[PDB]
Amino acid sequence: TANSGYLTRRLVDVAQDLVVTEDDCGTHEGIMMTPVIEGGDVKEPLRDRV
Amino acid sequence: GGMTNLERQQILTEEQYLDALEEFGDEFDAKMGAEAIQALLKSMDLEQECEQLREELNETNSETKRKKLTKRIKLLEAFVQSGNKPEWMILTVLPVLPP
Amino acid sequence: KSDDVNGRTKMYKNIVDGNHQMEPGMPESFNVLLKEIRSLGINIELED
Amino acid sequence: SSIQVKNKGSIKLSNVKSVVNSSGKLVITSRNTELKLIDEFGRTKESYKVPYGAVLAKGDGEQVAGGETVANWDPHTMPVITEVSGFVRFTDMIDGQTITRQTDELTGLSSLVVLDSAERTAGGKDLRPALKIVDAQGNDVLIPGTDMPAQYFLPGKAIVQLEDGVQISSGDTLARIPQGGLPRVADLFEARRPKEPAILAEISGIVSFGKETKGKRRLVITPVDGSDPYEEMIPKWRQLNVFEGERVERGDVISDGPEAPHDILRLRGVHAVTRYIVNEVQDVYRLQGVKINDKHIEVIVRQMLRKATIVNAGSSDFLEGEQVEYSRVKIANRELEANGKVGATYSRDLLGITKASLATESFISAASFQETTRVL
Amino acid sequence: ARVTVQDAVEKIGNRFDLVLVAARRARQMQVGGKDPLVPEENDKTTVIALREIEEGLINNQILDVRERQEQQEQEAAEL
DNA sequence: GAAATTGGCACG
DNA sequence: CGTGCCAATTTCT
């Protein structure tokens, strides 16, 4: 019960002041969303990662 | 204590203090307690020591000693840029809280 | 609702007066923090 | 043990250095070999990691069906298989100084067992026992497409398979070398180095050994085009995997194990760690049936990458070796890049959530978290 | 009364500006001398303001224009 | 109790 | 002289 509380307190304190302050930063770099495949099964389809 | 036989940060004891007192009459001052530390902090010049540390850092070559020197140059520059003084760390007047 | 001493009475008077509006003010437990920090020999102050 | 495909598709190979053996099959000489399955649409549905020195029953682009064993290898045996065909000529091994004579009591299949520097005599300490591949004419058969001949060094405790002069080809091993929960998330987000991290190599190019037993072993890396003189200290008491006779990439492991996030950031980038973390946390959360979107871990990763270390002062005001906020560097560099001057250079950092939150720009917001005395 | 504010959010466009506009109008109706633009049905000032916003009768521009007109008329009347 | 930082010592 | 390992100390549930 207490370890989760400590973890979420640290998570809140590390990222308390992150706020959407704009509408477009003017850059179009980013990540490539590929489905997760451990080797035998597709854990999550690409329709949920995008 | 002068640049004759003892350094400006050398530590003595009762017997050693007696020996040093018998050795040097003048140009020799030794103290104990917070007065000694305040005298050490007050007589320190920050700009000259900053220049000396900077030259000793940029001339000699090492890594651990370089970090040790840059850990002190930063503190000296922080003290210089702000209005604080080294000897304000020694309390002479003590505030007391509202009742 | 908790700490601003001069705002509690104003809010109560406004609620009784039919006007739902508050003058926020400043909490009284931050002045205590300032007085306890500056009784350690540390000069903390609000500026401007 | 071996790769067993489950569906029907096409076999694809990536980062593979393979050669046909004497039996006609395909053996692999690359550690980072990856096997993939494709379908008629073109998507990928399988992803296997093939170890060094494995036998493939199929080739790249070939068609297979469900339930077919396409790869097989010996896990307990690490091969030193060759690429060229020919006899063997022993070079620079003296029994009692570099190797030892031991015979199987029951089977009788015995050869010269290569000793290690920690056990062999000092005279053989400076000598490297290496097996050389030759032809019927006595010359040295060069690896095709290369210039350096085919001589392969062997480390300690190497069990030579066959005796000297026996005809071999590709696919024959020269020597045999015997081998979660909530805290997992709490350690992934705090970026803590594991017990025995997977040591990595900095730059690409050819690799080789160096000085021995000056505390530990040393490495030599010579890029094909870049500067060589960098040398890396490597502990030799842990089982290494570096192939000092093959070219390697910058982003490859030397030993094996869990890699620390700091090394991933320093040697592979930012978009590598921001996928490694969001996969290692999602693996923990997914097996319990918990659904969390990917934005929520990406913003925490972004908040972890919020500092930078100066490498050179440059034309700006920052000194040589201090640590400053990334936004300040990004604005100071853009105010000069748009101008006629040139900005400074920076190195990205990665910090734990308990250390990136106590290094903020506000002391009121940092004394509230913890360590009020040290902050004030 | 009311259960959802989706129409008001659609008309204003933002869920954070709707609160401020509705508070401004409700304070005009409550502590000021204004009267609702819609027939009040035993409703409070906040719900009346939301119902006015839902019908395109109240937004930031309308309030600013009416305030400027009121100030001009008052300064003309005081002479 | 665990983990990170600092001072002391063996070693090359 | 210059590195790295080991004991002390501190801070945190």
XYZ file of C-alpha atoms (C1' of nucleotides) in Angstrom:
677
model
C 0.000 0.000 0.000
C 2.820 2.452 0.855
C 5.340 1.787 -1.936
C 2.792 2.772 -4.587
C 2.076 5.987 -2.696
C 5.772 6.841 -2.515
C 6.201 6.104 -6.230
C 3.244 8.261 -7.256
C 4.414 11.086 -4.987
C 7.820 11.046 -6.683
C 6.181 10.880 -10.123
C 3.998 13.894 -9.311
C 6.905 15.890 -7.876
C 9.119 15.258 -10.913
C 6.502 16.459 -13.433
C 4.182 18.847 -11.597
C 4.731 21.929 -13.796
C 4.297 20.490 -17.303
C 1.470 22.357 -19.037
C 0.213 22.605 -22.615
C 1.256 26.190 -23.407
C 1.103 26.354 -27.220
C -0.643 24.879 -30.263
C 2.170 23.962 -32.699
C 5.931 24.032 -32.114
C 6.756 23.993 -35.833
C 8.742 20.739 -35.863
C 7.684 17.434 -37.406
C 10.241 15.030 -36.002
C 8.962 12.217 -33.818
C 8.883 8.511 -33.079
C 7.987 5.557 -35.293
C 5.075 3.493 -33.955
C 5.642 -0.201 -34.654
C 3.567 -3.016 -33.115
C 5.131 -4.891 -30.218
C 6.238 -8.412 -31.167
C 8.045 -10.510 -28.557
C 8.773 -13.107 -31.249
C 5.730 -15.356 -31.324
C 2.713 -13.136 -30.670
C 1.685 -9.576 -31.498
C 0.963 -8.222 -28.022
C -0.686 -4.965 -29.118
C -1.952 -3.985 -32.589
C -1.076 -0.682 -34.214
C -4.688 0.539 -33.992
C -4.178 1.215 -30.264
C -0.680 2.751 -30.418
C -1.707 5.549 -32.829
C 51.415 33.258 11.687
C 53.673 34.421 8.869
C 55.669 32.485 6.289
C 58.526 31.681 8.668
C 57.945 28.251 10.250
C 54.183 27.544 10.489
C 51.393 27.672 7.924
C 48.187 29.718 8.098
C 46.003 26.635 8.713
C 48.321 24.423 10.794
C 46.747 22.775 13.847
C 48.564 22.652 17.193
C 47.897 21.119 20.615
C 48.669 22.197 24.187
C 52.259 20.921 24.159
C 52.725 22.023 20.543
C 51.239 25.427 21.382
C 53.700 25.781 24.267
C 56.583 24.813 21.968
C 55.477 27.316 19.321
C 55.068 30.027 21.968
C 58.623 29.379 23.159
C 59.804 29.436 19.522
C 58.075 32.594 18.228
C 57.354 35.675 20.313
C 55.855 37.988 17.695
C 54.359 37.426 14.203
C 52.653 34.359 15.689
C 48.967 34.124 16.597
C 47.115 30.917 17.457
C 43.477 30.675 18.516
C 40.785 28.107 19.239
C 37.017 28.264 19.031
C 34.760 30.130 16.648
C 36.863 33.298 16.925
C 39.707 31.544 15.097
C 37.370 30.382 12.325
C 35.893 33.874 12.007
C 39.401 35.344 11.764
C 40.256 32.803 9.057
C 37.097 33.612 7.090
C 37.474 37.386 7.446
C 41.108 37.593 6.286
C 40.401 35.501 3.172
C 40.464 37.332 -0.161
C 38.091 35.827 -2.708
C 39.290 37.285 -6.026
C 42.972 36.394 -5.586
C 42.114 32.866 -4.456
C 39.753 32.550 -7.431
C 42.549 33.489 -9.839
C 44.975 31.102 -8.141
C 42.499 28.212 -8.263
C 41.708 28.945 -11.916
C 45.375 28.878 -12.925
C 46.057 25.755 -10.848
C 43.076 24.067 -12.527
C 43.889 25.026 -16.117
C 47.640 24.361 -15.827
C 47.897 21.010 -14.041
C 46.319 17.904 -15.576
C 44.149 15.440 -13.637
C 40.524 14.366 -13.249
C 39.665 13.853 -9.569
C 41.693 16.872 -8.448
C 40.155 18.843 -11.323
C 36.668 18.046 -10.018
C 37.749 18.961 -6.486
C 39.048 22.331 -7.702
C 35.972 23.104 -9.813
C 33.772 22.189 -6.836
C 35.401 25.065 -4.912
C 35.757 27.608 -7.728
C 31.980 27.429 -8.159
C 31.386 28.158 -4.465
C 33.847 31.062 -4.499
C 32.181 32.573 -7.571
C 28.755 32.074 -5.977
C 29.944 33.972 -2.902
C 31.451 36.767 -5.020
C 28.469 37.264 -7.353
C 26.015 37.461 -4.458
C 26.309 40.066 -1.724
C 27.116 37.550 1.008
C 30.389 37.454 2.942
C 32.302 34.431 4.270
C 32.255 35.553 7.915
C 28.452 35.816 8.135
C 28.367 32.050 8.767
C 29.621 32.704 12.323
C 26.773 33.969 14.488
C 27.321 37.098 16.571
C 23.667 38.100 17.083
C 20.950 35.460 17.475
C 17.332 36.148 16.423
C 14.490 35.085 18.707
C 11.023 34.182 17.461
C 7.835 36.140 18.188
C 6.146 34.854 21.359
C -11.867 28.462 3.885
C -8.759 27.559 5.902
C -6.126 30.149 6.720
C -6.455 33.733 5.410
C -7.588 35.499 8.575
C -8.900 38.670 6.926
C -10.577 36.773 4.080
C -12.673 34.434 6.220
C -14.710 37.304 7.675
C -15.091 39.015 4.290
C -16.319 35.770 2.708
C -18.782 35.187 5.552
C -20.089 38.760 5.301
C -20.455 38.441 1.521
C -22.274 35.093 1.784
C -24.706 36.590 4.314
C -25.061 39.597 1.969
C -26.014 37.444 -1.025
C -22.803 38.228 -2.939
C -20.665 35.164 -3.685
C -17.221 36.675 -4.191
C -13.940 36.438 -2.299
C -10.888 38.627 -1.788
C -8.173 35.952 -1.618
C -5.447 37.513 0.498
C -2.514 35.532 1.855
C -2.426 32.459 4.119
C -1.306 32.992 7.703
C 0.850 29.836 7.779
C 3.360 31.161 5.239
C 4.155 34.177 7.410
C 4.886 31.675 10.189
C 7.193 29.822 7.790
C 9.003 33.059 6.920
C 9.396 33.995 10.598
C 10.727 30.518 11.452
C 13.145 30.448 8.504
C 14.511 33.918 9.267
C 14.979 33.044 12.949
C 17.719 30.642 11.799
C 19.869 33.497 10.501
C 18.623 33.297 6.899
C 17.273 36.443 5.221
C 14.197 35.378 3.246
C 11.867 38.107 2.004
C 9.164 38.914 -0.522
C 10.241 41.551 -3.030
C 8.556 43.917 -5.490
C 16.745 -24.392 -27.870
C 15.863 -23.812 -31.527
C 13.594 -21.543 -33.551
C 10.213 -23.109 -34.383
C 7.984 -20.977 -36.610
C 4.246 -21.052 -35.901
C 2.654 -19.620 -39.066
C 3.127 -19.498 -42.840
C 5.044 -16.678 -44.506
C 8.490 -15.567 -45.685
C 11.769 -15.673 -43.756
C 13.723 -12.403 -43.552
C 17.194 -11.814 -42.113
C 18.638 -8.576 -40.756
C 22.188 -7.719 -39.651
C 23.398 -11.182 -40.669
C 26.864 -12.251 -41.834
C 26.333 -15.762 -43.186
C 28.250 -18.281 -45.284
C 27.468 -21.692 -46.769
C 28.987 -24.606 -44.855
C 30.369 -27.888 -46.207
C 27.021 -29.680 -45.805
C 25.292 -27.034 -47.946
C 23.498 -25.265 -45.091
C 24.004 -21.643 -44.026
C 25.942 -20.730 -40.881
C 26.033 -17.308 -39.219
C 29.096 -15.330 -38.109
C 27.299 -12.230 -36.751
C 26.083 -11.713 -33.187
C 23.330 -9.176 -33.977
C 21.519 -11.445 -36.456
C 17.730 -11.050 -36.378
C 15.115 -13.336 -37.943
C 11.701 -12.038 -39.030
C 8.530 -13.475 -40.557
C 6.614 -11.685 -43.316
C 3.215 -12.310 -44.898
C 1.793 -11.683 -48.361
C 0.612 -8.243 -47.216
C 4.156 -7.359 -46.113
C 3.726 -7.034 -42.341
C 5.999 -8.595 -39.719
C 4.641 -11.126 -37.223
C 7.732 -12.786 -35.682
C 11.048 -11.534 -34.301
C 13.753 -13.936 -33.100
C 17.366 -13.353 -32.073
C 19.715 -15.913 -33.641
C 22.958 -16.490 -31.676
C 26.472 -16.435 -33.116
C 27.287 -19.601 -35.038
C 23.873 -21.069 -35.845
C 22.703 -23.351 -38.646
C 19.806 -22.169 -40.819
C 17.812 -24.721 -42.803
C 16.437 -21.873 -44.958
C 17.750 -18.692 -46.555
C 16.663 -15.090 -46.906
C 13.480 -14.625 -48.923
C 12.614 -18.331 -48.931
C 9.088 -19.610 -48.340
C 8.133 -21.762 -45.346
C 4.965 -23.084 -43.706
C 3.601 -23.559 -40.210
C 5.502 -25.668 -37.706
C 8.885 -25.849 -39.455
C 12.211 -25.656 -37.607
C 14.140 -23.045 -39.599
C 17.086 -22.512 -37.223
C 19.091 -24.722 -34.885
C 22.215 -24.209 -32.798
C 24.148 -25.633 -29.863
C 23.674 -23.329 -26.844
C 26.375 -24.772 -24.571
C 28.994 -24.692 -27.366
C 30.305 -21.378 -28.696
C 31.711 -22.054 -32.189
C 34.759 -20.520 -33.842
C 33.535 -21.665 -37.274
C 35.438 -20.474 -40.350
C 34.397 -18.970 -43.680
C 36.967 -20.590 -45.981
C 37.707 -24.260 -46.678
C 40.993 -26.074 -46.222
C 43.245 -27.899 -43.798
C 44.507 -26.499 -40.476
C 48.092 -25.482 -39.707
C 48.888 -24.889 -36.044
C 50.713 -21.621 -35.347
C 52.293 -20.464 -32.071
C 51.061 -22.982 -29.497
C 53.518 -24.813 -27.227
C 52.268 -27.636 -25.022
C 52.961 -26.812 -21.386
C 53.217 -23.064 -22.081
C 50.025 -22.123 -23.961
C 47.952 -25.330 -24.103
C 47.638 -28.602 -22.179
C 47.286 -32.303 -22.969
C 44.086 -33.868 -21.617
C 42.346 -37.021 -22.835
C 38.796 -38.262 -22.352
C 38.801 -41.482 -20.344
C 35.607 -42.960 -21.848
C 34.933 -41.504 -25.307
C 38.566 -41.018 -26.339
C 37.846 -38.065 -28.658
C 40.663 -35.893 -27.333
C 42.765 -32.966 -28.532
C 44.945 -30.165 -27.142
C 43.000 -28.031 -24.661
C 43.865 -24.335 -24.877
C 44.820 -22.956 -21.469
C 44.192 -19.465 -20.103
C 46.669 -16.741 -19.191
C 45.600 -17.035 -15.539
C 46.831 -20.658 -15.476
C 49.431 -21.120 -18.231
C 53.098 -20.312 -17.717
C 54.428 -16.780 -18.108
C 56.357 -17.725 -21.252
C 53.127 -18.492 -23.071
C 51.481 -15.427 -21.539
C 52.860 -13.172 -24.292
C 52.074 -15.728 -27.027
C 48.684 -15.973 -28.731
C 47.582 -19.521 -29.675
C 45.774 -19.054 -32.985
C 44.448 -21.568 -35.503
C 45.269 -20.885 -39.158
C 43.245 -22.170 -42.112
C 45.354 -23.349 -45.058
C 44.908 -25.098 -48.392
C 46.434 -28.188 -49.991
C 49.224 -25.997 -51.412
C 50.285 -24.809 -47.944
C 49.259 -21.175 -48.457
C 46.754 -19.220 -46.352
C 43.252 -18.906 -47.806
C 42.069 -15.325 -47.374
C 38.470 -14.633 -46.398
C 36.616 -13.760 -49.638
C 36.307 -10.044 -50.287
C 38.968 -9.217 -47.674
C 42.748 -8.897 -47.400
C 43.764 -10.208 -43.974
C 44.333 -13.999 -44.010
C 42.304 -16.563 -42.045
C 43.951 -16.845 -38.632
C 41.620 -16.954 -35.619
C 42.885 -16.455 -32.077
C 41.465 -18.507 -29.222
C 40.868 -17.468 -25.598
C 41.440 -19.541 -22.482
C 39.583 -22.781 -21.779
C 39.147 -23.393 -25.514
C 38.581 -27.074 -26.328
C 39.982 -27.754 -29.798
C 37.611 -30.052 -31.675
C 39.901 -31.919 -34.092
C 43.656 -32.424 -34.288
C 46.110 -30.668 -36.603
C 45.909 -31.102 -40.366
C 42.356 -32.471 -40.525
C 40.399 -31.142 -43.497
C 37.721 -28.658 -42.415
C 35.440 -26.120 -44.074
C 32.721 -23.677 -43.067
C 30.396 -24.964 -40.366
C 33.131 -26.756 -38.392
C 33.885 -25.368 -34.937
C 37.549 -24.724 -34.166
C 37.086 -24.657 -30.382
C 34.337 -25.153 -27.806
C 33.902 -22.719 -24.908
C 31.554 -23.703 -22.050
C 29.229 -20.992 -20.780
C 9.677 -7.721 -11.525
C 6.483 -6.079 -10.318
C 6.408 -2.710 -8.547
C 10.162 -2.531 -7.752
C 10.853 -3.090 -11.462
C 8.894 0.060 -12.343
C 10.395 1.936 -9.387
C 13.887 1.087 -10.683
C 13.117 1.798 -14.346
C 11.868 5.287 -13.472
C 14.819 5.972 -11.142
C 17.414 4.976 -13.792
C 19.477 2.722 -11.533
C 22.465 0.787 -12.837
C 22.005 -2.999 -12.510
C 24.356 -5.318 -10.624
C 26.400 -6.406 -13.675
C 25.594 -4.050 -16.569
C 26.069 -5.144 -20.163
C 29.297 -3.344 -21.055
C 29.283 -1.586 -24.428
C 31.739 -0.304 -27.028
C 31.956 3.364 -27.975
C 32.864 3.546 -31.673
C 32.550 1.157 -34.611
C 35.299 -0.369 -36.759
C 37.550 -3.382 -36.408
C 38.217 -4.637 -32.879
C 41.106 -6.491 -31.249
C 42.646 -7.332 -27.884
C 45.500 -5.543 -26.119
C 47.398 -5.515 -22.835
C 46.582 -8.324 -20.402
C 46.184 -8.406 -16.616
C 46.920 -4.804 -15.689
C 44.069 -5.036 -13.221
C 41.841 -6.273 -16.041
C 41.964 -6.727 -19.803
C 42.089 -3.928 -22.385
C 40.448 -3.435 -25.783
C 41.570 -1.873 -29.074
C 39.166 -0.375 -31.622
C 40.294 0.877 -35.041
C 37.521 2.423 -37.165
C 37.695 1.923 -40.917
C 37.772 5.714 -41.344
C 37.730 7.176 -37.824
C 40.513 7.595 -35.292
C 41.659 4.423 -33.486
C 43.644 5.433 -30.374
C 40.741 5.024 -27.934
C 41.246 2.065 -25.591
C 38.644 0.651 -23.204
C 39.212 -1.158 -19.923
C 37.273 -4.440 -19.865
C 37.069 -6.870 -16.908
C 38.148 -10.291 -18.154
C 36.803 -12.219 -15.141
C 33.290 -12.101 -16.639
C 32.477 -14.117 -19.754
C 33.122 -11.840 -22.732
C 31.599 -12.107 -26.198
C 33.771 -9.735 -28.264
C 35.005 -11.230 -31.549
C 38.461 -9.665 -31.879
C 38.677 -10.937 -35.475
C 35.492 -9.314 -36.824
C 34.361 -5.763 -37.499
C 31.766 -4.400 -35.069
C 29.282 -1.532 -34.937
C 29.301 1.267 -32.374
C 25.937 0.222 -30.938
C 26.821 -3.324 -29.889
C 27.475 -5.135 -26.623
C 30.742 -6.648 -25.414
C 29.430 -8.605 -22.434
C 25.781 -9.554 -21.862
C 23.175 -8.584 -19.304
C 20.829 -5.715 -18.423
C 22.032 -2.448 -19.939
C 21.952 0.708 -17.842
C 19.802 3.538 -19.263
C 22.705 6.010 -19.096
C 24.769 3.953 -21.543
C 21.782 3.569 -23.886
C 21.314 7.349 -23.904
C 25.021 8.067 -24.366
C 25.696 5.502 -27.109
C 22.412 5.152 -29.033
C 20.460 8.407 -28.670
C 17.263 9.659 -27.068
C 14.645 8.002 -29.272
C 16.201 4.650 -28.306
C 15.834 5.128 -24.543
C 12.359 6.675 -24.917
C 11.282 3.392 -26.522
C 13.254 1.089 -24.206
C 11.656 2.639 -21.111
C 8.107 2.749 -22.519
C 8.469 -0.914 -23.484
C 10.040 -2.114 -20.220
C 7.309 -0.393 -18.188
C 4.480 -1.475 -20.481
C 5.700 -5.083 -20.211
C 5.267 -4.897 -16.429
C 1.854 -3.255 -16.709
C 0.480 -5.437 -19.518
C 0.863 -8.899 -17.969
C -1.413 -7.791 -15.106
C -4.132 -6.610 -17.503
C -3.606 -2.884 -16.860
C -4.238 -0.497 -19.769
C -2.255 2.760 -19.736
C -1.681 4.998 -22.742
C 1.809 5.733 -24.042
C 1.722 9.528 -23.595
C 1.877 9.185 -19.813
C 5.255 7.430 -19.830
C 6.651 9.642 -22.611
C 6.034 12.823 -20.612
C 7.849 11.332 -17.597
C 10.736 10.337 -19.873
C 10.779 13.908 -21.205
C 10.932 15.226 -17.639
C 13.875 12.889 -16.981
C 15.811 14.368 -19.938
C 15.908 17.914 -18.590
C 19.623 18.643 -17.985
C 22.813 18.935 -20.023
C 26.561 18.944 -19.409
C 28.877 21.362 -21.200
C 31.793 19.759 -23.034
C 33.408 22.992 -24.271
C 32.689 26.577 -23.265
C 32.346 27.772 -26.845
C 31.440 31.362 -27.639
C 28.764 31.450 -24.911
C 29.065 32.294 -21.204
C 28.929 28.768 -19.753
C 32.192 27.417 -18.360
C 33.923 24.217 -19.453
C 32.413 21.516 -17.257
C 29.200 22.579 -15.507
C 25.666 21.176 -15.696
C 22.840 23.469 -16.830
C 19.235 23.308 -17.986
C 18.620 22.159 -21.553
C 16.196 24.988 -22.373
C 18.769 27.652 -21.485
C 21.284 26.009 -23.827
C 18.653 25.687 -26.559
C 17.789 29.394 -26.366
C 21.391 30.634 -26.026
C 22.386 28.589 -29.082
C 19.419 29.813 -31.153
C 20.031 33.469 -30.279
C 23.527 33.102 -31.777
C 22.734 30.748 -34.671
C 20.235 33.297 -35.981
C 23.004 35.845 -35.363
C 26.459 35.685 -36.950
C 28.114 33.904 -34.022
C 28.210 30.172 -33.230
C 26.801 28.473 -30.146
C 28.238 25.912 -27.757
C 27.963 22.119 -27.597
C 26.162 20.025 -24.993
C 25.799 16.438 -23.792
C 22.383 15.090 -22.821
C 21.835 13.623 -19.358
C 19.440 11.142 -17.774
C 18.426 11.383 -14.120
C 16.103 9.558 -11.777
C 12.736 10.982 -10.825
C 14.081 11.605 -7.305
C 17.137 13.472 -8.635
C 15.623 15.389 -11.565
C 12.954 16.702 -9.165
C 15.429 17.934 -6.531
C 17.507 19.826 -9.134
C 14.860 22.351 -10.174
C 15.279 26.116 -10.556
C 12.988 26.932 -7.601
C 13.978 26.387 -3.975
C 10.412 26.759 -2.636
C 9.334 23.946 -4.959
C 12.370 21.828 -3.990
C 12.400 22.269 -0.202
C 8.806 21.000 -0.139
C 9.760 17.652 -1.694
C 12.527 16.522 0.682
C 15.917 17.510 2.118
C 14.875 20.969 3.275
C 18.093 21.513 5.245
C 20.383 20.673 2.321
C 18.391 22.897 -0.062
C 18.002 25.997 2.121
C -31.831 22.663 -13.492
C -29.368 21.023 -15.870
C -27.201 17.926 -16.129
C -24.726 18.584 -18.989
C -22.990 21.665 -20.384
C -21.947 20.222 -23.742
C -23.815 22.775 -25.876
C -22.252 25.700 -24.003
C -18.801 24.135 -24.401
C -19.404 23.693 -28.137
C -20.512 27.312 -28.538
C -17.707 28.852 -26.469
C -15.145 26.351 -27.795
C -13.125 25.845 -24.605
C -14.111 24.338 -21.266
C -11.940 26.791 -19.304
C -13.224 29.987 -20.949
C -16.848 28.909 -20.495
C -16.411 28.984 -16.714
C -15.042 32.535 -16.799
C -17.689 33.870 -19.203
C -20.498 32.248 -17.214
C -19.081 33.589 -13.941
C -18.884 37.102 -15.394
C -22.479 36.983 -16.645
C -23.765 35.405 -13.421
C -22.043 38.082 -11.337
C -23.615 40.721 -13.577
C -27.047 39.201 -12.946
C -26.562 38.542 -9.219
C -24.804 41.530 -7.640
C -25.583 43.946 -10.487
C -28.900 45.250 -11.722
C -29.068 43.172 -14.900
C -31.934 40.847 -15.808
C -31.816 37.527 -17.678
C -32.113 37.414 -21.454
C -34.011 34.103 -21.162
C -37.136 33.313 -19.093
C -35.856 32.261 -15.677
C -37.613 29.141 -14.368
C -36.841 29.043 -10.631
C -33.178 28.857 -11.675
C -30.057 30.312 -10.099
C -27.729 32.825 -11.724
C -25.130 30.275 -12.863
C -27.668 28.047 -14.626
C -29.362 31.085 -16.200
C -25.983 32.265 -17.502
C -25.268 28.807 -18.929
C -28.677 28.706 -20.634
C -28.004 32.153 -22.113
C -24.606 30.980 -23.385
C -26.190 27.889 -24.957
C -28.434 29.984 -27.229
C -25.730 32.269 -28.624
C -26.910 35.262 -26.597
C -23.786 35.657 -24.430
C -20.066 35.430 -25.167
C -16.938 37.470 -24.496
C -17.417 39.818 -27.460
C -21.079 40.498 -26.635
C -20.230 41.265 -23.004
C -17.370 43.582 -23.993
C -19.520 45.434 -26.544
C -22.364 45.866 -24.054
C -19.983 47.072 -21.333
C -18.421 49.644 -23.666
C -21.879 50.820 -24.745
C -22.978 51.112 -21.108
C -19.863 53.104 -20.197
C -20.347 55.465 -23.146
C -24.029 56.003 -22.334
C -23.277 56.603 -18.644
C -20.546 59.133 -19.450
C -22.910 60.882 -21.870
C -25.745 60.957 -19.322
C -23.593 62.296 -16.476
C -22.454 65.148 -18.767
C 17.131 -2.069 5.885
C 18.588 0.220 0.919
C 20.778 3.480 -1.732
C 23.961 7.565 -2.769
C 27.839 10.315 -1.447
C 32.350 11.125 1.003
C 36.791 10.104 3.151
C 40.647 6.630 3.728
C 43.846 3.226 1.963
C 45.948 -0.456 -1.215
C 47.947 -0.410 -5.622
C 50.241 0.676 -10.157
C 51.836 10.995 -8.405
C 47.016 9.088 -10.163
C 42.656 5.100 -9.814
C 39.879 2.327 -7.847
C 38.048 -0.369 -3.875
C 36.275 -0.257 0.896
C 34.410 1.580 5.327
C 31.258 5.772 7.324
C 27.692 8.718 7.076
C 23.280 10.408 5.748
C 18.465 10.287 4.126
C 14.451 7.786 2.997
C 10.401 4.861 3.127
